[PDB]
Write a protein that binds this DNA or RNA. Structure first.
Lengths: 201, 64, 143, 117
RNA sequence: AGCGGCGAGCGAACGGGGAGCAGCCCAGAGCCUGAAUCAGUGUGUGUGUUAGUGGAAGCGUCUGGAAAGGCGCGCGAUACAGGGUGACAGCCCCGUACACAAAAAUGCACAUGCUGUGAGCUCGAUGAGUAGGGCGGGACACGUGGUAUCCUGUCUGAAUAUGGGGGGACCAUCCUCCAAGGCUAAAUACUCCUGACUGACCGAUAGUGAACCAGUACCGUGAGGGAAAGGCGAAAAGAACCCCGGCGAGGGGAGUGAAAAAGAACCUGAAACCGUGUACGUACAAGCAGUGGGAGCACAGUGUGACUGCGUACCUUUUGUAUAAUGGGUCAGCGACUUAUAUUCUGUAGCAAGGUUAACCGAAUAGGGGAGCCGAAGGGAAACCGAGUCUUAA
């Protein structure tokens, strides 16, 4: 394919496999859910009938009293004892194949040039590490909810979007399923789209 | 945990190419003088496990 | 292509049987288990190969044979693997460098299983009669 | 994700107690009794949509039989005399005529008495 | 693989990928002779911990009881984590990002001075009631089995490096090691406790037994058991005063307040259950109390329902229940097919004669890691042969 720049108008060359694939929705839905489930901190637990504080004394006798038969004050039928299938902390991660993860990202980047939400820049830096300048760096660009993806380790630019809520700065190696979708524009420097084209082959 | 193979079944059956199981025939251990030589001749090849028994064997042999 | 627009493939997610939840679900009041027996109890159900108390099939039948301890250290080399051995010389130790056989293997056999194409050199292995007639049919020498 | 079920069990119970208005005693107030009052009342409603079409045909036939006999014929000979005359009025309208326009029924009986005999 | 009433079941190693990786002493006398070590103690430095300090910017306006809301127009941002404020605050407050701080006492490194052990070289030395054995047990995945190896209660008993152990009965080779002395960091397991921080965790019958003076009240001789019980309002402004009453209790005013139907027995205030008022029905009519038809009446379609046809609850369990079989006084809340891992099958998705990694590393859902696993070849008990192979002299 071709990716026209923001103002230099000199479209750098990308492989059409990575930015012009047909969209696979079942592939992208699976990798956007496995990203979402692998973000779960599965930290909860309840108490089974073993773990509730109480005695194993049978409350009344088995026969004789006209009550229903019981054998533990910690049974789950009873108030204040026992969750039946109580939770444990678990791992909600999913396995994604690498060719499914890379096929998803190649299918998201192909769709971002379809709905014109990929804009490739050649440089996006900011002189001072100030949020005020970047707040401006995006008015002339006409951006409000954006994800910046750079190839270098720009810490001046990185701090200047740390307070802006709708602006995210990445490093071209930590771009993911849900970040390439949940932002209105994706803006990539030309050194960064060289690397992203590479890792997705 | 892993499923434990019924180890006494893993000595009676062996899995074949299309998926079934070969097994030695019964009735050829002892008490053979009274058995006919024709009858003992047909118990010497290995046979295939029958249709109705196969669900009981793949239950027993999960790593076959 | 937003987060509230992505769907699974059709039929990729079946729901999952929820048992004991009323008359309309078709799984209420027994949980698909039927009426009172061993198999309708919690944890009930007999072990594998149980036949009632009839002698089970894996105990009705004789054990036979032995484990070889030489079949565990032998492997078969298809002719598809004679092109991946990285050098045109198929030793035993160069089949392991390409991850073809396995590191604990002492004997390999090259069998006629598909398309030897290149000048190859099998040294120190066994080949079959078909594989010998195919390695030499592509220009290969067996030692 | 614990789910408390007080809101939708209240609504499910309230829906059934609302169908039980006018029922006697605990069949209007108590859910356990009012549920099987409402389930029985729907069972009867199914059955008496069948019985309604019989009970009215019973009522028409009893009125045509009376109104034929004032004109001097039985119900059987009047219905046979109408079919031999190829008159295709049903019994709902034949009974409607019999109370509202009697002189339009004495004409129907005459047209039956003629073409019968 | 094996073990195994060869049943139920038990279950390895070798080898490979990783985390972390240090080796040293005594059985000993010399030359040299603090000779690095490894410790403790003390100044010294670097660094935490134990108090803290600074933090950056918003006003009009409408609704409202009150603005943090709406509409308008600005400003901070390495700070839009969070919390509080009369409703939802970047800019009101506390903070946060950031930049800083220590009398004194301590953790850690380092620099070490001073003390204790004690190097390096020459040589010798090479751990005996032991190994092994007989008996009985136990541990090894291994139940004495053909069974190694280890431990040892009992009884015995070597060789002493030209010698001894092991290599799964045993023997011969020939490979490998040197028992009968000891020390040894990291990778590992855990959390009474402290600090932050997080949650597709709970939200007062839940979550700890315990949101509340809870291991309490209570119960037991005792060991021990073991509760229930949260919410006024923004702020007590928590009701001055007047009435009835017994200088009561409760109430009615007056007042506060946005609200007292927020009045403390206090947010919301459901249902069972109990009343009052109104409409209709009902004192000659027999029964699952409804349903179908249906007058009359009362309202503004609703309500009631005379008379009338049909009509023996629900569940459970059963050949079969109105059954005089089970269960339920009723309401409200809770209450029962889960979870982990392995396996097989269907759906689906990716890649296909290949497909996928595990641990771990890691700027952490990326990338690396192909150890492996499954598949592409099977017959045979096996050796073996191999698109065939076993059977069998054939």
């Amino acid at each position: 394919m071709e990716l026209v720049l923001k103002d230099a108008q000199s479209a750098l060359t990308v492989s059409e496999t990575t930015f012009g694939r047909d969209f696979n929705e079942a592939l992208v839905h699976q990798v956007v859910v496995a990203y979402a489930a692998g973000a779960r901190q599965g930290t909860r637990a309840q108490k089974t009938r073993a773990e509730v504080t109480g005695s194993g004394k049978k409350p009344w006798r088995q026969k004789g009293t006209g009550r229903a038969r019981s054998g533990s004050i910690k049974s789950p039928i009873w108030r204040s004892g026992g969750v039946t299938f109580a939770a444990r902390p678990q791992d909600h991660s999913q396995k994604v194949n690498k060719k499914m993860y890379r096929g998803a990202l190649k299918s998201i980047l192909s769709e971002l040039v379809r709905q014109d939400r990929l804009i490739v820049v050649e440089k996006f830096s900011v002189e001072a590490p100030k949020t005020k300048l970047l707040a401006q760096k995006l008015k002339d660009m006409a951006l409000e909810d954006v994800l910046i993806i750079t190839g270098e380790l720009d810490e001046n630019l990185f701090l200047a979007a740390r307070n802006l809520h709708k602006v995210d700065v990445r490093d071209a190696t930590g771009i993911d399923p849900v970040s390439l979708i949940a932002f209105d524009k994706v803006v990539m420097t030309a050194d960064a789209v060289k690397q992203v084209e590479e890792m997705l082959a | 945990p892993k499923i434990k193979t019924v180890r006494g079944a893993a000595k009676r059956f062996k899995k074949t190419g299309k998926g079934g199981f070969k097994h030695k025939h019964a009735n050829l251990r002892h008490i053979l003088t009274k058995k006919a030589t024709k009858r003992k001749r047909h118990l010497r090849p290995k046979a295939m496990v029958s249709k109705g028994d196969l669900g009981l064997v793949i239950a027993c042999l999960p790593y076959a | 292509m937003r987060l509230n627009t992505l769907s699974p493939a059709e039929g990729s997610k079946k729901a999952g049987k929820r048992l004991g939840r009323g008359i309309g679900s078709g799984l209420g009041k027994t949980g698909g288990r039927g009426h009172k027996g061993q198999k309708s109890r919690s944890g009930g159900g007999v072990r594998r190969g149980f036949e009632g108390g009839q002698m089970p099939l894996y105990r009705r039948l004789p054990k036979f044979g032995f484990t070889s301890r030489k079949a565990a250290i032998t492997a078969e080399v298809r002719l598809s693997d004679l092109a991946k051995v990285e050098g045109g010389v198929v030793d035993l130790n160069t089949l392991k460098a390409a991850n073809i056989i396995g590191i604990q293997i002492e004997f390999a056999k090259v069998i006629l299983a598909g398309e030897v194409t290149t000048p190859v050199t099998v040294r120190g292995l066994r080949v079959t009669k078909g594989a010998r007639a195919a390695i030499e049919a592509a220009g290969g020498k067996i030692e | 994700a614990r789910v408390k079920r007080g809101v939708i069990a209240r609504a499910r119970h309230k829906k059934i107690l609302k169908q039980a208005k006018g029922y006697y005693g605990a069949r209007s107030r108590v859910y356990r009794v009012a549920f099987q009052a409402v389930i029985k009342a729907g069972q009867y409603a199914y059955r008496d949509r069948r019985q309604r079409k019989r009970q009215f045909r019973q009522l028409w036939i009893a009125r045509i039989n009376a109104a034929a006999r004032q004109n001097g014929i039985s119900y059987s000979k009047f219905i046979n005399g109408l079919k031999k005359a190829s008159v295709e009025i049903d019994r709902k309208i034949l009974a409607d005529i019999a109370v509202f326009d009697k002189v339009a029924f004495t004409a129907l009986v005459e047209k039956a008495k003629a073409a019968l005999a």
